[PDB]
Protein backbone atom coordinates (compact mmCIF):
# COMPACT_ATOMS: atom_id res chain seq x y z
CA UNK A 1 0.00 0.00 0.00
CA UNK A 2 1.15 3.37 -0.30
CA UNK A 3 0.82 6.04 2.39
CA UNK A 4 0.20 9.84 2.44
CA UNK A 5 1.77 11.17 5.36
CA UNK A 6 3.79 13.39 3.90
CA UNK A 7 0.87 14.42 1.38
CA UNK A 8 -1.36 15.09 3.68
CA UNK A 9 0.28 17.83 5.38
CA UNK A 10 2.56 18.94 2.58
CA UNK A 11 -0.16 20.77 0.87
CA UNK A 12 -1.96 21.00 4.58
CA UNK A 13 -0.11 23.06 6.97
CA UNK A 14 -2.04 24.85 10.15
CA UNK A 15 0.01 27.69 12.07
CA UNK A 16 -1.26 25.50 15.40
CA UNK A 17 0.31 22.75 13.80
CA UNK A 18 3.65 24.44 11.93
CA UNK A 19 7.17 24.25 12.92
CA UNK A 20 8.56 26.99 14.97
CA UNK A 21 10.56 27.35 18.07
CA UNK A 22 9.18 28.27 21.74
CA UNK A 23 9.99 31.46 22.61
CA UNK A 24 9.61 32.78 26.73
CA UNK A 25 7.44 35.93 26.66
Known sequence: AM???FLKQ???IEN??????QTVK
Do not use: D, T
Not at 16 to 21: D, H, K, R
Open 10 to 12: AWF
Open 16 to 21: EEQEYV
Open 3 to 5: VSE
